[PDB]
Design a protein around this motif. Structure first.
Motif, PDB file in Angstrom:
ATOM      1  N   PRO A 175     -28.544  39.986 -33.375  1.00 35.97           N
ATOM      2  CA  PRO A 175     -27.866  38.451 -33.911  1.00 35.97           C
ATOM      3  C   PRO A 175     -26.732  38.458 -33.824  1.00 35.97           C
ATOM      4  CG  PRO A 175     -29.247  39.785 -35.576  1.00 35.97           C
ATOM      5  CD  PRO A 175     -29.441  40.678 -34.477  1.00 35.97           C
ATOM      6  N   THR A 194     -34.769  40.698 -32.930  1.00 30.86           N
ATOM      7  CA  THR A 194     -35.500  40.152 -34.010  1.00 30.86           C
ATOM      8  C   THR A 194     -37.022  39.955 -33.725  1.00 30.86           C
ATOM      9  OG1 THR A 194     -33.690  39.500 -35.147  1.00 30.86           O
ATOM     10  CG2 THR A 194     -35.730  38.733 -35.957  1.00 30.86           C
ATOM     11  N   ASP A 236     -32.708  35.977 -32.076  1.00 30.09           N
ATOM     12  CA  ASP A 236     -32.540  36.811 -31.088  1.00 30.09           C
ATOM     13  C   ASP A 236     -33.662  37.688 -30.631  1.00 30.09           C
ATOM     14  OD1 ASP A 236     -31.558  37.735 -33.807  1.00 30.09           O
ATOM     15  OD2 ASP A 236     -32.077  39.601 -32.621  1.00 30.09           O
TER      16      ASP A 236
END
Ligand SMILES: Cc1cc(F)cc(C)c1Oc1ccc(C(C)(C)O)cc1-c1cn(C)c(=O)cc1NCC(=O)NC1CC1
Ligand SMILES: Cc1cc(F)cc(C)c1Oc1ccc(C(C)(C)O)cc1-c1cn(C)c(=O)cc1NCC(=O)NC1CC1
Ligand SMILES: Cc1cc(F)cc(C)c1Oc1ccc(C(C)(C)O)cc1-c1cn(C)c(=O)cc1NCC(=O)NC1CC1
Lengths: 115, 107, 110
Positions: B27, B50, B47
């Motif tokens: 992130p 994730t 991102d």
């Protein structure tokens, strides 16, 4: 036809819930639950002699995190774990007899795999 | 080939390995980077770290939900930063590659 | 392997219950060491929590959606087995269980 079809069970699920879970419990599992740590045992050669390393630790991550394309691939990684151990160690070592025991068991459990 | 497997093993492995991946592997940390307005402007941050976690932990309903997350990542970067910026040229390269890889998506 | 049913339990059922006010006591195991409950892990032979359930959905543990439902049931009944009825903690489980049963009714088939 009162003979209803034999139950459709997924192969990779079986690998996680049945095959791995059995091997993992077994008393000789501990040297294979994480990778071989070639720092902490003095063996800076391990990584040159073993092309592609492998352990139940990594196989478990893979089953849990949608890595494997098919059950064949997961089995490959098991064989590779054993064959790594037989190469790098001198036959009749202790590590090798432990691996031979887990392999005997592995092949039992694989034979009752569904389809 | 299940499309979500293709996204994890092929699309993301390719992108993750790329030169320019590192600013996108986690992130955008607005506190470290000292960017207070970032979370106000970017309503849905995203991102590859994730997306990876989502592919590994059964989050997505389907492949298109995962493709939208990749596009969000790129557009978030085009919104917040100015064109010409290094960060933007990197995202642009990753987008180019992302799209070549998405053209071999099995069905 | 991941049926749209297990997908619903992760995205809709668990996510709903995790956000509810009363979730926190069921988000991880009952730490019986901390609470000085020596009899707990002796009276509850199969502990459960949403923490463990979250883990299991994320890591492809379940044979199918119905095994996950079983876990939710056990979580609630564990609570009802160990705790006196009327206790704060029981009423909390009941609230969550009512809510569980609502969400589980809209579960899709196949
Ligand atoms: C070194 C050793 C001594 C024993 F008594 C038993 C085992 C299993 C041994 O092997 C290992 C012990 C610990 C670990 C840890 C946990 C650190 O990864 C690994 C091994 C080990 C594991 N595997 C899979 C191997 O193929 C080889 C291992 N070691 C062999 C070794 O270091 N041998 C040196 C004496 C020459
Ligand atoms: C700040 C910066 C300086 C550079 F020389 C090159 C890049 C990519 C830079 O961007 C980032 C560097 C590190 C990090 C970490 C890894 C900490 O999250 C993030 C960014 C960054 C990444 N992404 C995707 C963005 O959209 C925006 C980022 N920050 C740019 C930034 O701070 N811009 C304002 C200073 C002008
Ligand atoms: C002890 C207590 C007091 C309250 F005012 C509210 C709750 C929920 C309470 O229960 C718990 C509080 C914390 C924790 C932690 C987070 C440490 O694991 C667990 C419980 C608890 C949770 N669940 C699900 C239970 O079934 C039982 C719990 N405690 C029972 C208990 O300790 N009762 C004490 C009087 C004996």
């Amino acid at each position: 036809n009162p003979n209803k079809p034999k139950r459709q069970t997924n192969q990779l699920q079986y690998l996680l819930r049945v095959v791995l879970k059995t091997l993992w419990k077994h008393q000789f599992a501990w040297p294979f639950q994480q990778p071989v740590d070639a720092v902490k045992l003095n063996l800076p050669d391990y990584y040159k002699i073993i092309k592609t390393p492998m352990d139940m630790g990594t196989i478990k991550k893979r089953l849990e995190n949608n890595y494997y394309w098919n059950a064949q691939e997961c089995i490959q990684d098991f064989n590779t774990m054993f064959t790594n151990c037989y190469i790098y160690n001198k036959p009749g070592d202790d590590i090798v007899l432990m691996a031979e025991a887990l392999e005997k068991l592995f092949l039992q459990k694989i034979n009752e795999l569904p389809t």
